[PDB]
Amino acid sequence: DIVLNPLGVPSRMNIGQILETHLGMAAKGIGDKINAMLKQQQEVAKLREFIQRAYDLGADVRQKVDLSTFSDEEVMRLAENLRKGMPIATPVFDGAKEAEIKELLKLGDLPTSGQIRLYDGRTGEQFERPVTVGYMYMLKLNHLVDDKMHARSTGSYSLVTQQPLGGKAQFGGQRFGEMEVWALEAYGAAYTLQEMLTVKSDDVNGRTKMYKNIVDGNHQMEPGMPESFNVLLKEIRSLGINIELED
Amino acid sequence: SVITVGPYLRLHQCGLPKKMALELFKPFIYGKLELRGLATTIKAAKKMVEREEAVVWDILDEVIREHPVLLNRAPTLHRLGIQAFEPVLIEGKAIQLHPLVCAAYNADFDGDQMAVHVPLTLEAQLEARALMMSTNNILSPANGEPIIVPSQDVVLGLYYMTRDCVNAKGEGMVLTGPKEAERLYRSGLASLHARVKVRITEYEKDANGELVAKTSLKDTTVGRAILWMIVPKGLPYSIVNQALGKKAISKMLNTCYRILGLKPTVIFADQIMYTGFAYAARSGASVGIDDMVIPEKKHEIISEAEAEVAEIQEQFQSGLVTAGERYNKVIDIWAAANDRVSKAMMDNLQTETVINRDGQEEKQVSFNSIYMMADSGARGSAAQIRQLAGMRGLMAKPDGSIIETPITANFREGLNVLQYFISTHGARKGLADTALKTANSGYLTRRLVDVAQDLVVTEDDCGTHEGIMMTPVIEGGDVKEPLRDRVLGRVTAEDVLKPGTADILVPRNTLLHEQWCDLLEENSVDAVKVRSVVSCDTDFGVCAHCYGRDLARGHIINKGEAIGVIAAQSIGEPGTQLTMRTFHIGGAASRAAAESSIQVKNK
Amino acid sequence: RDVHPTHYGRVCPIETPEGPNIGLINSLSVYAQTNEYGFLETPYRKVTDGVVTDEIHYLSAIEEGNYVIAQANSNLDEEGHFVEDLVTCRSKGESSLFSRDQVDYMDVSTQQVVSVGASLIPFLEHDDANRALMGANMQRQAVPTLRADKPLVGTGMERAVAVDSGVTAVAKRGGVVQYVDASRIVIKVNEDEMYPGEAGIDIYNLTKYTRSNQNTCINQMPCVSLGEPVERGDVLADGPSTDLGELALGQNMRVAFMPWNGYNFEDSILVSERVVQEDRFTTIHIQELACVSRDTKLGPEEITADIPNVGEAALSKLDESGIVYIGAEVTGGDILVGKVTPKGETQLTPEEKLLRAIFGEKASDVKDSSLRVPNGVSGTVIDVQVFTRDGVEKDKRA
Amino acid sequence: GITKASLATESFISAASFQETTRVLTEAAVAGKRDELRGLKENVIVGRLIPAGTGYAYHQDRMRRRAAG
Amino acid sequence: DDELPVYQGETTQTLQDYLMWQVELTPFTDTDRAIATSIVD
Amino acid sequence: MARVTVQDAVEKIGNRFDLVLVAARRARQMQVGGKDPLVPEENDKTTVIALREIEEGLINNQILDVRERQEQQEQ
Amino acid sequence: VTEFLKPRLVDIEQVSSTHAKVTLEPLERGFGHTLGNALRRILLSSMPGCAVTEVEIDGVLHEYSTKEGVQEDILEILLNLKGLAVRVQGKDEVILTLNKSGIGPVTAADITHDGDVEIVKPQHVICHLTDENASISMRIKVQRGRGYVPASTRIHSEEDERPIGRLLVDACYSPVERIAYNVEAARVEQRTDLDKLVIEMETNGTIDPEEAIRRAATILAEQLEAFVDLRDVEFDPILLRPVDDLELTVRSANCLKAEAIHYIGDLVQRTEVELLKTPNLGKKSLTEIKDVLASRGLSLGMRLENWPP
Amino acid sequence: SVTEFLKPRLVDIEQVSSTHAKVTLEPLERGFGHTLGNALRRILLSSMPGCAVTEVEIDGVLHEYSTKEGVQEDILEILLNLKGLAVRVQGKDEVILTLNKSGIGPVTAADITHDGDVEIVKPQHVICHLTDENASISMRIKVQRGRGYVPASTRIHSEEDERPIGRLLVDACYSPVERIAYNVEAARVEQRTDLDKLVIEMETNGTIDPEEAIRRAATILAEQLEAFVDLRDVR
């Protein structure tokens, strides 16, 4: 159903994954026995015998459930309830040992190693080397790209500073921050840097001229002076300091 | 948007989600619409792209064609952290990023997100083609060595293709061309083996501006041969004949870049990517609990150590070896136990896998999965294996001490409630370092930038004869950095002399490159006078003969580059990964060796 | 931030936010409780002689260090004596082996150190602690899907969490089921448990599709059949991400470990189209939008029938009252409720009288103010509420 | 010593925007210093090309205007 | 100040703003643009 | 004829920063108006046209200067 | 006397309604795997099918509602109908209806019988009824198809909007399910190295195996055609309106015809500085054409693209 | 639209020299790229009629390694040069040729005895360079028809029972096709995005036009399935 990359697993040293797969494999296996069994219209007695024989496997394991206590249906019920897999439950640090997993797994006529020959689907050719296949139990996290993909070209601005708005929903444009400038400077690409700073954020006359030339196929900039500098000059004039630009 | 992988899609390209462009390119589209005559007025255009039917997608393609976009990610640490690409429209909500650049961006695919920006104008587009496209810069303008280097499953596939194996049918056939593809695809043979003798043309660059063909029959393997179809002429066969691990492949793109230049190497890379994925996938490489092999000896070493430490603690019960010294003592026991259990598991997972030609044991390197994975250089390390199979070892208490009783369990057998709870100490202590490291790192780069930005590179030559004398770094435990690595690039102040008196191998000032460094490597010269910045070549600029190699493109630095900022981000980029503060790095005991007696490695 | 040795079975060393509040926000451990004085105390079995008595005592962190406490996972006999003569224990800030007769306590279960979050994760031994630390955090931010699959390998903990979380419908005072259905489930209680003179039965109304604070569905679907006996504590329904009283946050998937053409590279993940056809991993999302009609300086505002400057096209999905029919498929800026806001005093001169004459003024000063759907959002209208005012004479479809 | 060395830069516009703004602007207001715009941060903040790279060409052209008069 | 959503503004578009935007993009001469700007107000 | 690598046009004029200036000054001509390409168009945008003409050695700083003096003298 | 040998379809064996095997006896050295693989991909890829598509039901106005006295949500009932397998004769549209009342399960047998429509499992469950006095009535629309076509994609038909209460469901069409094969040595002993291909199919009961195989290989064989012979190696600007009907009176029309101008476009792109100087125009006629062409086109410039004539 | 599928409308061919050819077909139904390509590839190398050298008889030394009277080239290399020799054969399945050359200078394929049925593509292929002296060479090359590629794993090893010594069987390359590699690229038609562009890269030794070889393999595969299409659209 779903193909995942072995190379995750050694470096990160989370081996729950692997043992999960194997015991999952072995878990489906029993339900496949029972699936196939009920699908062949077997008698209730034999089905009782294989489930009883399933539950009681393992060293110790403290769960004593046995059948013969509940009779006729009740057993057919559960068996149809576990047709889709037998739900094995391994508590936290007293959990199942490998040994018990191979044991459980031999009852399902699955290979002890938990790896199986698989075939390519395009070429039809066998992969060299066996492969671990196994049921692992996935989740889908609350991060979805429908919520993520944004994209704006030209939208609403801010009254002061006249820059685009913050975020998606409101259509941000996309902070182009100090490290990002540093990287362009480092490339020495000063035009890209110059249209970022001006024309496509705070140069108002220059954003207009820009977009009108683009619509016309000019692709030329006509850069001006960004608002936010002007503001700064007023805000420093608001202390008793003049700062003026001398030609 | 979110990033996915790009696993076709050549280097200079970039899967851009269809829906998402169409926005980014709006102005551009309306232009085209008004040209073709599909809209007479702006409102018409506007309305048709709002209705987004039909012609518009057709025109989008025409708009995007050759218009470079630029992608950017997250903390931008160095200049590589933003790069420029030719988009290819793809239905989807996510951006496909070619693998090879994942290095630079420091991005995996666990839900990272990229910004995208559109250069407008012309100037900007050209600055994107001739500066930020990912095919200009394959080399890291700090160390100078390639980025782009294949990682992770590309490595595992090349390493699988080129191996030797004992037997593996169709061994000792002689074939020519090879091509040999015939024979792997057809069965007929096993690429890991056969140690097939195949005839091969070389095409050496021995003659200047000409490729002289040399052919011969070599002993090599099938997958070697197969892989040789990719290598673009001008290189030796000896580059592809070997186990070919990660290192090997960086070196191979390095040599390719140096020998035959940029254009055939940027293609050659691609190709490597593809054949890596290919073969690795064919190999069926997987991992399974039996792949972690705990050595039978482990029980025995741990029992011996439990007995030793019992002896010392009974000596403590008798008054001898006070807990002061007993602590360091017991540390010295369990650490040596760690090393011995480690040595046992490494000996068991390498070699073994003994195949048989008539003698029953040729004793070949193992094909164990986890072993191949670490060995290839793809993921992981020996230390990281030891956690899965041998001991975990001594645990660091959050106060910077060591607990007397180490963890004896690998992850194959689980940890004990108590031992896990102890592991926890150091886990969390170390998570919480990356926080601090981000802040302090960045503040550092901030200041470095701030100081260094005014630097420019203005005058071409200065003419100063001052410089810095350049040597190896030798210390106790031989030499870490050899003198070629230090003196490479740069330029020469005054001259150099052979070990013979009044014999010069370089005139005046010279640019020192791989050839000149071979000249200096073959002779006995242990010091070279080299001019460098900070000797203040010129006034404001730091002229290019100081300085003197741009790294990145291997020619000398051209006039008008920054240098400032490149340095700062080069210094500062690393350090994200650093020891940070508050470590003694002792490892053995607090007491010094106290031996003033010297020793020599060689004669 | 750091784990201190007294967090032993009090907070948890694994579950913690990985973000820049790290070790700050912690989670109670499983069997943890709290005193009258506000201090964390944790249970232990009492050991007298070298037999383990089944009496349990809650020890506070100051009380705990004085004593010797054994290890959660250790050996034992039918008689209750430890198998091994040297038992690994804790004393004070430390751990080491002690004799059989020295240790007076024992940890109850192995779950003690771990929090409920992590108590759910199979094979947590084999996992590194940091990596365990992520996954514990990730099972929170999963999202319940249309059909809930029971995890096929699990700890045993899932029954508790489900039924404790109170998202399931649980049967009080039980008995045979009289009536069943999707939204409703009644139990005819046994004659044994009943208050005299009230008689009667117990009814349970299940909650159908309901926004959650994270704009996800809450949906209860009945487990029990009909004509079936039920005892107190059995679950009648499953909340979302619940199967027959177990906590089922994701789906089982047949996984193969192997690189496949670079599509699974780095930490990415390739999936069969099967999975997408069969609709596991399909999740519902309900979003609220509200319209309110209010009194301005210029007089009251009324909702709908009819609007200025608006086509019949747009108005086709509305009702007599102006709210959308329940059931409509709504996209883009289709009008969910319409509403009019009057402007000031348009009087006279021939053009004003002319527009009022031609078009009947079309309610004149009113404007277009309505509840149109936010652009780039979609979906059917599952429910409409319409809270009104007393004495407004609402009529219509209210 | 690199923070001292930033704050001590001839151009009062950079280094104002590095760290200490009050201090910087007071030294500059009392002294009456002119910026000259010769580095990269100033050019950015004013919004003009940077003296580097592609724009480096263009700052020579303008610089030759100052020397020639 | 900054780094917060101060009520800096929205810069919405009225009808005259939008009409003027529409004039910017159409092939008017130097004079005709003056008449257009003269009418849209 | 999309250009993956500019090196061939960088050997023609050193320092790519120069290339970008010349490329765009030449492309501007065809883009806005009052020029036609010296090289057969492959459907590509004007920028690539310009870089190709630089890689062919038909266009450079000196050549654009001579063409400018020729057009100013002919006008 | 090399030639080849052609396989023949022989020994179809039917384990159950769903499960089957089909064996292709006389195959050469490498053909096993060839045809095995191809056949598999054509089988699973495409094959024709009949799926439910639209279900409309008397209770419920949308999919998230519930009906009183059924156990299931209407979602779950949709998903049970999803799974209904049925074949039909010539007719591709086939609407069908089902009614019922009283306590117990609603199976596929409750569907009102039609001549050409045939249900493969009568026991397939749909819903339930909890008590009497509750009925269901629904009308299911089963059409023929080929791949997986979601509901969400197929709405591109647009035109008139479908009425409220019509539920749409994802159609999975192709019955083929899972498909394996293996090749094994032939027993003919006339010539060794002959082998045979068996294919194991499991389908919903809709397709007969020989027709499945048959179709697959027809699709494949028709797909090789250009390999048998390798060979070889509108959008317009919306307006051609003659300038005559724009009512230029006398002077302006003739002044436009003096430049040999036909229709509009060739006239529409010129700067007023370029047009202002020709004989007879003056300042008046320029404003006249400015007024006339001010309506409709508005343009008085573009660079456009090309011309059809 | 059921049972109606797409056919490639491009089927373009672009060739390097005579013997290298790269054909692209577009579009194809998604999934068909792999299908058709893999089948064609499979067939071309597995099974295909051709003829090669299945044995060579050299005078004197019968060992697989020997001095061979100073040919300057070990007989491994000669047998290997005789492996890549291209030959056409008529009706008759098996034919044996002889060659005798003395003097100085390389031994090309033109010195081989000329027979009506045997057709040599180029003399340029060199068997050996011999040595400068008064010395000669005489050998009997053997060719037969075959299919595929039959190595010296078997090639009728005869179990050492060969009466007239000689032997040293050569791996015989029958199928006249050298490399075949297919490749599968996104194609788009109208708004439907997911389709298949199949690319075939095919390099052949000679004796057969590449494209015509493709043609052939298609007729073989088509000829296998012709049993089954008899029910649906037979005529």
Curated annotation (Swiss-Prot), chain C:
Co-administration of salinamide and rifampicin or salinamide and myxopyronin suppresses the emergence of resistance to both antibiotics. GO terms for molecular function: DNA binding; DNA-directed RNA polymerase activity; ribonucleoside binding. One of its GO terms (cellular component) is membrane. Acetylated on several lysine residues in the presence of glucose. Changing residue 266 to K: Disrupts the enzyme's active center. It comes from the Bacteria. Keywords: Acetylation, Antibiotic resistance, DNA-directed RNA polymerase, Nucleotidyltransferase, Transcription, Transferase. The keyword Transcription applies. One of its GO terms (biological process) is cell motility. DNA-dependent RNA polymerase (RNAP) catalyzes the transcription of DNA into RNA using the four ribonucleoside triphosphates as substrates. Belongs to the RNA polymerase beta chain family. This is DNA-directed RNA polymerase subunit beta. The gene is rpoB.
From Swiss-Prot, chain D:
It comes from the Bacteria. Acetylated on several lysine residues in the presence of glucose. Disulfide bonds: none annotated. Co-administration of salinamide and rifampicin or salinamide and myxopyronin suppresses the emergence of resistance to both antibiotics. The RNAP catalytic core consists of 2 alpha, 1 beta, 1 beta' and 1 omega subunit. When a sigma factor is associated with the core the holoenzyme is formed, which can initiate transcription. The rRNA transcription and antitermination complex (rrnTAC) consists of RNAP, NusA, NusB, NusE (rpsJ), NusG, SubB, ribosomal protein S4, DNA and precursor rRNA; S4 is more flexible than other subunits. Belongs to the RNA polymerase beta' chain family. DNA-dependent RNA polymerase (RNAP) catalyzes the transcription of DNA into RNA using the four ribonucleoside triphosphates as substrates. Resistance to the antibiotics salinamide A, salinamide B, rifampicin, streptolydigin, CBR703, myxopyronin, and lipiarmycin can result from mutations in this protein. This is DNA-directed RNA polymerase subunit beta'. The lineage of its organism: Bacteria, Pseudomonadati, Pseudomonadota, Gammaproteobacteria, Enterobacterales.
Swiss-Prot record, chain F:
It is an enzyme of class 2 (transferase). The keyword 4Fe-4S does not apply. Coiled coil: none annotated. It comes from the Bacteria. GO terms for molecular function: bacterial-type RNA polymerase core enzyme binding; DNA binding; DNA-directed RNA polymerase activity. GO terms for biological process: bacterial-type flagellum assembly; bacterial-type flagellum-dependent cell motility; cell motility; cellular response to cell envelope stress; DNA-templated transcription initiation; intracellular iron ion homeostasis; nitrate assimilation; protein-containing complex assembly. The keyword Transcription applies. Keywords: DNA-directed RNA polymerase, Nucleotidyltransferase, Transcription, Transferase. Its EC number is 2.7.7.6. It catalyses: RNA(n) + a ribonucleoside 5'-triphosphate = RNA(n+1) + diphosphate. GO terms for cellular component: cytosol; cytosolic DNA-directed RNA polymerase complex; RNA polymerase complex; transcription elongation factor complex. Belongs to the RNA polymerase subunit omega family. The RNAP catalytic core consists of 2 alpha, 1 beta, 1 beta' and 1 omega subunit. When a sigma factor is associated with the core the holoenzyme is formed, which can initiate transcription. The rRNA transcription and antitermination complex (rrnTAC) consists of RNAP, NusA, NusB, NusE (rpsJ), NusG, SubB, ribosomal protein S4, DNA and precursor rRNA; S4 is more flexible than other subunits. This is DNA-directed RNA polymerase subunit omega. The gene is rpoZ.
UniProtKB/Swiss-Prot annotation, chain H:
The keyword Transcription applies. Residues 1-232 are annotated as: Alpha N-terminal domain (alpha-NTD). (Microbial infection) ADP-ribosylated on both alpha subunits by the phage T4 protein ModA. ADP-ribosylated on only one of the alpha subunits by the phage T4 protein Alt. Disulfide bonds: none annotated. GO terms for molecular function: DNA binding; DNA-directed RNA polymerase activity; protein dimerization activity. The keyword Hydrolase does not apply. Its EC number is 2.7.7.6. It catalyses: RNA(n) + a ribonucleoside 5'-triphosphate = RNA(n+1) + diphosphate. It comes from the Bacteria. Belongs to the RNA polymerase alpha chain family. DNA-dependent RNA polymerase (RNAP) catalyzes the transcription of DNA into RNA using the four ribonucleoside triphosphates as substrates. This subunit plays an important role in subunit assembly since its dimerization is the first step in the sequential assembly of subunits to form the holoenzyme. Homodimer. The RNAP catalytic core consists of 2 alpha, 1 beta, 1 beta' and 1 omega subunit. When a sigma factor is associated with the core the holoenzyme is formed, which can initiate transcription. Both the N- and C-terminus interact with different regions of transcriptional regulator CRP. The rRNA transcription and antitermination complex (rrnTAC) consists of RNAP, NusA, NusB, NusE (rpsJ), NusG, SubB, ribosomal protein S4, DNA and precursor rRNA; S4 is more flexible than other subunits. This is DNA-directed RNA polymerase subunit alpha. The chain holds residues 4 to 238 of 329 of the full protein.
